[PDB]
């Protein structure tokens, strides 16, 4: 089962041209059978196609875009790309590559968040939610989504609840991430929230502890 | 251009329950459909292709048929894990098409939330500015509410809340509010209180601290 | 003579009488003609057809954009079915498209509109892609049987194969969905292949299916062994059981002169027989008959040499015949070295040549039969565009009571014989890209 994972800018200026690769693994880029496509997702809205390649090499586009977009791909570094152009605030979405067989999309990537704004890049703060007994971080001012949190290295699973972030009236975004856990562990086991915000390349690891 | 018209856009239905989504479509499709599962904040996991034929690892609970251009998508006996967003696509004619999408959450027994306090960290505090935290955990329904009171006067767009998407197991809910002030602000006052008011309580819980 | 009779723009192939309409399948072309006096009413254009790597086929290619073209293909008409049963309705299958198949619906109170309601039938294969079942027809030749059983319809098909890895099967049978929108093979004994090892060094051709007496019968012209030269003609028996072939049992076909061996099938027919030649063979008024018009063949080859014969196979003797127990496992299927074994008999069937050698001297390329009173006759075609008709009897052959060139272009083995009240109606014979209506009864 080969997978597929996007990469490219978090943020991007208006006017400026959007570029993004799905880097392919466990699979060869070059078949007859199956071939390659992009979509997207706007934010909270429904998914919307943007273009194919066939392994003719052909290209196929969607007629709201087709004066902007041009897909590619790249035998030797088994990759295809997107380049959106005259890029606009509509054009904030989630952006995901897909295997294609017979024009259905059959493996997805986990997705790439673009965000079209003059804004600054903004790194996050990591407060400590300080203590059955809840703990947590408070993952505060930072841009463009998304920031990723997981407990322990990925060791701490149940009971976490990470938040959906909030657009606060900054323009900058906040999300919170809470861990249920008995009383009687808090004396005794320590807990790290590890927070990563890729487009500022922040690494963040904080240690939560009671009173 | 060949425009898939899905419904309906929201569905709430019990365990064991068969849930049943239609697709319609504005032109001949004949069998070029698919039907996707997407869990929120992922990617779109292939269910049914051809209309009506059954993915390599899906569940058999699992079904859908149609043709031209009505199309239906049954999930024969509910579960937990099967709270998603679900989308019709069309590939007949291009460009391909995706419907405007059907949320389908679980109903069950009302929870009351466990309902916890966060005074903003010192570290914060220092920065300049005071975050207070309030947390519901685990309840259902989804709809609550949250008022924050500060020496005993309410506040007003002060706050913001985020709730998270259904749980895969005990299909139950949680709820973060946040009440931001200025340091200055945050040390004028010394009661700070949010007052959960939720289906599943007998009456408000308030849960309070004392600044210090 | 002034027959009924139109001439097409394209070579006809296939031809099928239904409603008071005569439907034929021809290249790039089906045309729907009158039955009263073969008058053109409307005609459907099935290509030419674009082949193009981005387009697949069934999908709407002209939404695309700007296609730059692959190549442009002639439709020839493979196959033509008519359903009944899901619908009033008419399945084309064409050389082009992946043998796909295409299905005409037929409004209530207007019989030819072809053009009205046209469903493609195909669905896309994810998991396997590899394995069509939307792909009927083979381009070389194809023989399409449509049987009805359990409120569900049954597509029986024989395709000849040459090595083309993309992905037919040499003998299969797909149930057609009730929704119509495909196919779907049930199982993995659904169907027979010719291994990959011997798809060129030994072909198949597929004369005629058909069923009775509770099984399926196909007919074919095969290599004598894998190794041998010599040309051969079988009879292919399976059952329809389990919804997958089982008890697949093929023995050779042989008619003989008397020993001169006409053995290659050029057509065939099945149909009841008249009082004098059921009591002849040692058949019933209602029993079926394979009719089978043979030629000799040309030394290590499957050509025809202007040397024909035609011999009866009433079924039933044929069933009693194989239900006879030497052996063998059918050579093609595994290596060379009705209820699990799938079987090639070795001792051929023979039959006396009931016209016993009165057309030694020309090549049968078409029969039908009907029955007149007591008689049964038979509506022969040949090489040179003669028809003729001649009353058969095993008790003395007769001299053909009408005879005469009917075109330049050999007579078709595809042909209809339909009745009117009175017993006496009509046949329609096809001679390249003419078909004529010629009655019966002189």
């Given at each position: 089962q080969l997978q597929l994972q996007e990469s490219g800018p978090g943020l991007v200026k208006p006017s400026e041209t959007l570029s993004l690769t799905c880097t392919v693994s466990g699979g060869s880029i070059s078949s007859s059978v199956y071939y390659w496509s992009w979509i997207r997702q706007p934010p909270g809205k429904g998914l919307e196609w943007i273009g194919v390649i066939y392994p003719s090499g052909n290209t196929y586009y969607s007629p709201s875009l087709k004066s902007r977009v041009t897909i590619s791909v790249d035998t030797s570094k088994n990759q295809f790309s997107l380049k959106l152009s005259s890029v606009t605030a509509a054009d904030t979405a989630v952006y995901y590559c897909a295997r294609t067989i017979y024009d259905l999309f059959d493996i997805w990537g986990q997705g790439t968040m673009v965000t079209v704004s003059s804004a600054s890049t903004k790194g996050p703060s990591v407060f400590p939610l300080a203590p059955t007994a809840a703990l947590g971080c408070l993952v505060k001012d930072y841009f463009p989504e998304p920031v990723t949190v997981s407990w322990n290295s990925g060791a701490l699973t149940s009971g976490v609840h990470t938040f959906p972030a909030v657009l606060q009236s900054s323009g900058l975004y906040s999300l919170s991430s809470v861990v249920t856990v008995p009383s009687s562990s808090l004396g005794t086991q320590t807990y790290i929230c590890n927070v990563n915000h890729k487009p500022s390349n922040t690494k963040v690891d904080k240690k939560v502890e009671p009173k | 251009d060949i425009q898939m018209t899905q419904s309906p856009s929201s569905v709430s239905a019990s365990v064991?329950?068969?849930?049943?989504?239609?697709?319609?479509?504005?032109?001949?499709?004949?069998?070029?459909?698919?039907?996707?599962?997407?869990?929120?904040?992922?990617?779109?996991?292939?269910?049914?292709?051809?209309?009506?034929?059954?993915?390599?690892?899906?569940?058999?609970?699992?079904?859908?048929?149609?043709?031209?251009?009505?199309?239906?998508?049954?999930?024969?006996?509910?579960?937990?894990?099967?709270?998603?967003?679900?989308?019709?696509?069309?590939?007949?004619?291009?460009?391909?098409?995706?419907?405007?999408?059907?949320?389908?959450?679980?109903?069950?027994?009302?929870?009351?939330?466990?309902?916890?306090?966060?005074?903003?960290?010192?570290?914060?505090?220092?920065?300049?500015?005071?975050?207070?935290?309030?947390?519901?955990?685990?309840?259902?329904?989804?709809?609550?509410?949250?008022?924050?009171?500060?020496?005993?006067?309410?506040?007003?767009?002060?706050?913001?809340?985020?709730?998270?998407?259904?749980?895969?197991?005990?299909?139950?809910?949680?709820?973060?509010?946040?009440?931001?002030?200025?340091?200055?602000?945050?040390?004028?006052?010394?009661?700070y209180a949010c007052e959960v008011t939720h289906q599943g309580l007998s009456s408000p819980v308030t849960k309070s601290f004392n600044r210090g | 003579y002034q027959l009924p009779n139109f001439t097409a723009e394209t070579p006809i192939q296939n031809v099928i009488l239904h409603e008071h309409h005569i439907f034929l399948g021809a290249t790039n072309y089906i045309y729907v003609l009158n039955e009263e006096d073969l008058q053109k009413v409307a005609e459907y254009k099935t290509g030419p057809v674009l082949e193009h790597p981005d387009c697949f086929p069934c999908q709407d290619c002209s939404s695309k954009a700007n296609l730059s073209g692959g190549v442009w293909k002639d439709n020839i008409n493979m196959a033509l079915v008519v359903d009944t049963y899901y619908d009033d309705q008419l399945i084309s299958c064409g050389s082009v498209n992946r043998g796909t198949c295409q299905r005409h619906v037929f409004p209530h109170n207007h019989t030819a509109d072809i053009q009205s309601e046209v469903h493609c039938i195909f669905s896309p294969q994810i998991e396997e892609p590899s394995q069509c079942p939307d792909c009927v027809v083979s381009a070389l030749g194809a023989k399409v049987l449509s049987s009805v059983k359990d409120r569900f319809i049954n597509f029986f098909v024989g395709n000849t194969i040459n090595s083309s890895y993309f992905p037919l099967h040499s003998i299969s049978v797909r149930r057609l969905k009730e929704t119509k929108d495909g196919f779907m093979f049930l199982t993995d004994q659904s169907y027979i292949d010719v291994l990959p090892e011997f798809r060129d060094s030994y072909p198949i051709k597929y004369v005629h299916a058909f069923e009775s007496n509770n099984f399926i019968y196909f007919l074919t012209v095969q290599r004598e062994t894998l190794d041998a030269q010599t040309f051969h003609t079988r009879i292919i028996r399976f059952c329809s059981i389990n919804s997958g072939l089982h008890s697949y049992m093929e023995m050779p076909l042989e008619c003989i002169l008397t020993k001169e061996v006409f053995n290659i099938l050029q057509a065939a027919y099945v149909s009841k027989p008249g009082a004098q030649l059921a009591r002849q063979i040692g058949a019933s008024l209602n029993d079926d008959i394979l009719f089978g018009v043979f030629a000799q063949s040309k030394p290590d080859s499957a050509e025809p040499m202007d040397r024909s014969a035609m011999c009866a196979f009433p079924i039933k003797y044929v069933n009693d015949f194989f239900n006879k127990i030497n052996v063998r496992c059918l050579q093609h299927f595994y290596g060379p070295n009705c209820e699990e074994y799938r079987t090639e008999f070795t001792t051929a069937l023979q039959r006396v040549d009931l016209f016993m050698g009165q057309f030694s001297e020309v090549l049968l390329t078409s029969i039908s039969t009907f029955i007149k009173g007591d008689l049964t006759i038979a509506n022969l075609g040949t090489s040179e565009g003669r028809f003729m008709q001649v009353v058969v009897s095993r008790s003395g052959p007769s001299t053909p009571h009408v005879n005469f060139l009917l075109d330049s272009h050999p007579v078709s083995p595809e042909v209809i014989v339909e009745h009117t009240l009175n017993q006496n109606g009509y046949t329609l014979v096809i001679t390249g890209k003419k078909i004529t209506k010629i009655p019966l009864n002189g």
């Open positions: - | 064991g329950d068969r849930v049943t989504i239609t697709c319609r479509a504005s032109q001949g499709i004949s069998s070029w459909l698919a039907w996707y599962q997407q869990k929120p904040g992922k990617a779109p996991k292939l269910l049914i292709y051809a209309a009506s034929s059954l993915q390599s690892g899906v569940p058999s609970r699992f079904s859908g048929s149609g043709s031209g251009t009505d199309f239906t998508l049954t999930i024969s006996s509910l579960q937990p894990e099967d709270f998603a967003t679900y989308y019709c696509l069309q590939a007949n004619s291009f460009p391909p098409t995706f419907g405007g999408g059907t949320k389908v959450e679980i109903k069950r027994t009302v929870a009351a939330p466990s309902v916890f306090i966060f005074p903003p960290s010192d570290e914060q505090l220092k920065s300049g500015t005071a975050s207070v935290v309030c947390l519901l955990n685990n309840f259902y329904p989804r709809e609550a509410k949250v008022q924050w009171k500060v020496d005993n006067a309410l506040q007003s767009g002060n706050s913001q809340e985020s709730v998270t998407e259904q749980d895969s197991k005990d299909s139950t809910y949680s709820l973060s509010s946040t009440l931001t002030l200025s340091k200055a602000d945050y040390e004028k006052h010394k009661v | -």
